[PDB]
Amino acid sequence: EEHVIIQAEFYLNPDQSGEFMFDFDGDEIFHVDMAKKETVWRLEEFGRFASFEAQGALANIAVDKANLEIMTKRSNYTPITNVPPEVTVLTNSPVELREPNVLICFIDKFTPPVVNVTWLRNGKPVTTGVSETVFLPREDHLFRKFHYLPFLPSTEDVYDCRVEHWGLDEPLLKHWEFDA
Amino acid sequence: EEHVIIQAEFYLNPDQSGEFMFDFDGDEIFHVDMAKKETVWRLEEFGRFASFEAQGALANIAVDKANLEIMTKRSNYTPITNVPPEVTVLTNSPVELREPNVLICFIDKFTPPVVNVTWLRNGKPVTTGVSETVFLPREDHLFRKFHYLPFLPSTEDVYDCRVEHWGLDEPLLKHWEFDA
Amino acid sequence: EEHVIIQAEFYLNPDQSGEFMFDFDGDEIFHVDMAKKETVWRLEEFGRFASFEAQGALANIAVDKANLEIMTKRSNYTPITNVPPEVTVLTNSPVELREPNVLICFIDKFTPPVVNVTWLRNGKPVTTGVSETVFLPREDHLFRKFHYLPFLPSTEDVYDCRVEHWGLDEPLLKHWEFDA
Amino acid sequence: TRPRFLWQPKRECHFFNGTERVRFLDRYFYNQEESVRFDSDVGEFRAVTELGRPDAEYWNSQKDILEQARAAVDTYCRHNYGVVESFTVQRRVQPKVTVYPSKTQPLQHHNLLVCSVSGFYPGSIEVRWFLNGQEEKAGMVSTGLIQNGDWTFQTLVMLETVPRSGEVYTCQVEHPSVTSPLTVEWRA
Amino acid sequence: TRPRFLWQPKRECHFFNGTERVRFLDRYFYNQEESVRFDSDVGEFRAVTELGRPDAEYWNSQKDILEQARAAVDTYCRHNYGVVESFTVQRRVQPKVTVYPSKTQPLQHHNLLVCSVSGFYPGSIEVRWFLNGQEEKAGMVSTGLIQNGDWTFQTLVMLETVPRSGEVYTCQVEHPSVTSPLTVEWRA
Amino acid sequence: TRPRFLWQPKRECHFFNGTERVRFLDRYFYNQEESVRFDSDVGEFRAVTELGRPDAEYWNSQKDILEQARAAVDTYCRHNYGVVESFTVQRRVQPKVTVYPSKTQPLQHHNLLVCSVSGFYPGSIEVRWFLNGQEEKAGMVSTGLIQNGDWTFQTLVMLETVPRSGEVYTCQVEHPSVTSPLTVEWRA
Amino acid sequence: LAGQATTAYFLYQQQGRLDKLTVTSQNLQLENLRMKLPKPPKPVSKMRMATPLLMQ
Amino acid sequence: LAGQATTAYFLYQQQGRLDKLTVTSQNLQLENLRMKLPKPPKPVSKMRMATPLLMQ
Amino acid sequence: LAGQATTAYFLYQQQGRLDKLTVTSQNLQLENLRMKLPKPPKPVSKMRMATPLLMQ
């Protein structure tokens, strides 16, 4: 019955991107969206059970940004080995023809936590009803990221998860198709 | 065609809890949630018909808190007779098997307006999709409170409304079951 | 492939009403609601594609209000010819019996952009589930406005769009009925 | 379980026949007991209990407070009436009516009739039963207007009878929302 | 019914063939009449009506304002084009097409054909009718592109004919969103 | 493609058997490498790599920082455990189980059995197969707990067999959420 | 001989359920249109709140 | 003799209505998944607003 | 002779689809009631956030 509670407060430079979350055995309790300044609970049922002050998290990210600038000067501007993001395309439940599912693109084992993920249905971009989870941490400190595409399964459509990461010379193109 | 418009602005100590509402023949026009600082209309159709400035209500509750502190010193710290909350479990419409209904737990004739209401389905707590109305007033100044549990009726499940009030030595456990 | 991007920032006096929008070939990219201080995108899919700072728009409307006051003193208080709002009642899709449609009341070619539009189902006002778009511009600078009433079509109900504009001596009453 | 302290103002607005006569009852109740009862009918600032006597004196000491309370009869109550009339006073939602049999005791056959008037507003319902077109009496045992809190009411008027597949068992409902009395019939 | 005053700026951005040539027409219209018409094609600050003449002079007096307006041809129009291209310029939604008969006069049998092209973007539709595989003419009486306001258009092109269960009554639609002309047929 | 810099703190809270023993591992990791590893088990402020050595010294220089970190073992981890217990530690969602055949190679008949345990929490599943009521072995080739990110897990344990319409092909699941082992059967 | 009864037995219940099912579907689809509505703005009507004072 | 016609009469309309009803249900259930989505954030794309000046 | 088979063929699939369709409709209608709920407030439980310091 051992459990771990973690707090991820990463900030990248130069990208002007930072996040905040609470990690409970890998899963995410919530995440403070900097843009909306809101405590976005991973499950809304948690908001009816607990609470959090979002403005406090933004103070940390400002401090995290400051430390990174301090570390950058002290580290003589050393770069980061851009690990290739091993990508696996899965579904939340066994794909059921014409039964809504959430394709899950597992952008795994990568750094820095800034990636370009685009869902391609029949080769064309999909930007309507497509969600993504905040960059989730791992034991060896390589980020995870899930992209959710609520879709009505069909054999006519072939989905893709284009994953553009600086560690990849060529863009990754993982594929999914209805076969069950 | 006589009608009454009331304004309830109660604040309790020690509980750090206060509310605000407009009473129209017992029903609630709206209520200013202190946490969200929003004019939460009881029916959203009223927001498309009227408006209210939520920040003004919070000023009153601060004044209401101040007066209660003033009255507490003047009243030589006299307590409140904790009236037992007579509880009746009802449904918004005649229970229809497998047809969504909102169980209504009528926490009636109680003070102070701080109660612990938990819905128990088959003896286990339910904290997913469970709503409650702000503490509503009465003619003799004993609060009302409705708890809403949108449920799909089933004979397999037996619901409960555990009502923990300081006036009750033992917790109240009212019961509901599908019988129509 | 010629396209036009416009920016409408009108403010009326005496009405204390001003708006903001981006016009792309007549359609509306988004509009900054002064009351909510939010960048309300016409399609929410645009919010997942672009962004806008709503507070900046409110600064313009304050400047637009100031200029109108400056122009009013310089124009010796000249009024506006209140053009009659030609009204056409249409549907978003061919009316399908018992199949949800959005009646569209086209308040067209009118000024000033303050009108009283009310949907009358069987002669009674409808104020539940009735939407309106911000006052949209035209080439000759006469505003457009669409009113949306998501309705389940029925021959029993006859809808109306009462359009009260100062240019009209008598109220306009356009009519719709299911005939397909 | 510690001693508590409660301060709930109740600013009541009583207007009769629209706004022909408006009564502004300003109640400040402390621990389910009143302190001051500023009323427009009286006009003068009063106090009900001995605890609220100092409170009334301070508020009537300043003439500005008196004017604010006295002007509240038309600024607060009357203006709000027009604002809230459109969806509360004029609110006429349909009184959905269902009639079903019921048993007075467990393990016994049905011997009661409940005329369920659920989901209406405002609360001025009337229930009257009929048998074969003839009104029945001695069955006006009503459970009262049970408020649902969602701006709706609920009432279960019960009349005792034994079904025999020989009568019509007609209930009736008279509400402002419907110009014609809403009927309902039930046969075994 | 009091005199009104309206101040609606219209900052137009005209770019042709993507962003090969960008025209920035800055219109400040007062009471449905223009005041200034700062244009990138002209570049110089002008004024249309006599009322807006002082307005133009003040704005061209400061060289900073001129630079801001002149730099707006690529900072405002051109940059926004790239930002808004993905979902407005490249927006290609399917032109749902339905064809149904209609009557020109009440109480008369159907004598019209309406090729309903509802729910598309952008507005560059084309409609052409056919009979038994042969194109029909003299039926291009269109109602025009009726904007639905929800980023969609609507058009009802009408061609007059009398159904006889002997023809196919084929309409056609040509839109950028579909690489192949969308056909539709209707037989009585 | 420019050089990057990443600063991700990892404030870990390890408690065993509820809150009997709480371990507060404070990790500040820079570019996938640790800088300081303030731990409650050690208590003393340490540093893993040579880069984080100055960071640890500054933070242990102030006694207030030490007290804040040392008090965090019960103020941060222990208090949060009670707050987050109700919906994370006690969270027991049902392990939906489906069993379907599959083919190891394309264009070949089905020769695999996948016991799909999708949609459960927490991740302590157990899978064991059966044939005609007799447990089968040598089929524990599991794909591992694939996290779905929506506070749910997923696992596809595969056992190789050839259907012959003679066996029952029973899989089993043992999870804290269900007091009784969840069974599932599949016959061709 | 029993086929007529069985078919009507299936026919009756499928028809009755589906009629109410179509209505609750179309009305549900109508709720989606209402939920997709642009959230009409705050009108000019403003309910007024009284300002309580302190108890000295 | 008429049973064949009556059964097909019930069979045809129930099948036609239900096919469209299943699609509008699955798509509705798909809208629920979309409405349950975590509301993707604000991208880096920022439309620019011009700043009008006063009329002196 | 084939009418019995054809009717049951229609009867079986219409019944099976509709049973799951009714459940996904009632549960969907139940989601509407949940979405119409008054959005229960923030409880007294407050998860605590640690305050990181600067690297000198």
Author numbering:
A (entry chain D), B (entry chain G), C (entry chain A): 3 to 182
D (entry chain H), E (entry chain B), F (entry chain E): 3 to 190
G (entry chain I), H (entry chain C), I (entry chain F): 61 to 116
Anything the authors wrote about it?
pmcThe major histocompatibility complex class II (MHC-II) molecules play a crucial role against pathogens and foreign antigens in adaptive immune responses by presenting peptide antigens to CD4+ T lymphocytes. The assembly and trafficking of MHC-II molecules are regulated processes involving invariant chain (Ii), which acts as a chaperone associated with MHC-II subunits during MHC-II biosynthesis and antigen processing. Previous studies have shown that Ii forms a homotrimer (Ii3), associating with MHC-II heterodimers to create a trimer of trimeric complex, Ii3:(αβ)3 (6, 7). CLIP lodges within the peptide-binding groove of MHC-II, acting as a “placeholder” to prevent premature peptide loading.
We determined the structures of HLA-DR/Ii and HLA-DQ/Ii trimers to a final resolution of 3.0 and 3.1 Å, respectively. Despite having similar resolution, the density map of HLA-DQ exhibits superior clarity. Within this map, the TM domain of both HLA-DQ alpha and beta chains is distinctly discernible. In contrast, the TM domain of HLA-DR is not resolved to the same extent. The overall HLAαβ/Ii structures are approximately 140 Å in height and 80 Å in the longest dimension of width. These assembled complexes adopt a C3 symmetric trimeric configuration. HLA-DR and HLA-DQ bind to the CLIP region in a way that closely mirrors findings from previous studies. Specifically, in our study, Lys102 and Lys106 on CLIP exhibit the potential for forming polar interactions with Glu55 in HLA-DRα, as well as interactions with Gln53 and Asp57 on HLA-DQ. The interaction between Ii (chain C) and its own HLA-DRα (chain A) extends beyond the previously observed engagement with CLIP and the groove. This expanded interaction involves a hydrogen bond between Lys80 on Ii and Glu101 on HLA-DRα.
